[PDB]
Amino acid sequence: LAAWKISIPYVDFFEDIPVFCIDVERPEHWSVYRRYLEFYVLESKLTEFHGAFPDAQLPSKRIIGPKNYEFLKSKREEFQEYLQKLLQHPELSNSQLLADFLSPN
C-alpha cells in the first residue's frame, strides 16, 4: 500500500492557464498543480497497464470550450473523487505514473 490521501480543494492558475491544485497528504504534506488534460493522459496511461479496472472514470473531454475556469470548478469534485479512488485501488498501489502525477509542481 502507498496510501497517500488527497483533496482537490480548489482550481487555480499559471496566469496566461487554469489548473487543479491537488492537495496531497501522508506527517508529510504537499500540493501539485495538474491540468485538465493530464488526468486524461494519466488515465490513458494507467488503464493501459493495470488489470481491468473501472470504479474510477473520467467524464469525456469536452471540446466545446470555453475550457475556462468555471468549467474546471465544475469538475473539481469528480476529479477529486477519481483521484481518491485510484489510491484505494489495488494493483495501482505502486504505480510510478500515479506518483509522478501527485509529485510536487
Dist. CA 98–CA 80, nearest whole Å: 14
| Total count of domains within the chain | 1
Contact 101/84 with Cβ under 8 angstroms?
Answer: no
Chain center to CA of 97: 11
Query: Is 76 buried (19+), middle (13-18) or exposed (0-12) by CB count in 10 A?
Result: middle
Range of the domain at 7: 1-105
Resolution (A): 2.5
Q: What are the C-alpha distances in Å from 86 to residues 9, 13, 53, 54, 55? A: 18, 25, 9, 10, 8
Dist. CA 64–CA 22, nearest whole Å: 25
Contact 43/34 with Cβ under 8 angstroms?
Answer: no
Contact 53/83 with Cβ under 8 angstroms?
Answer: no
At 57, which CATH number? 3.30.1520.10
Contact 6/87 with Cβ under 8 angstroms?
Answer: yes
Strand, coil or helix: what is 59?
A: coil
Q: What are the C-alpha distances in Å from 101 to residues 34, 66, 70? A: 8, 25, 23
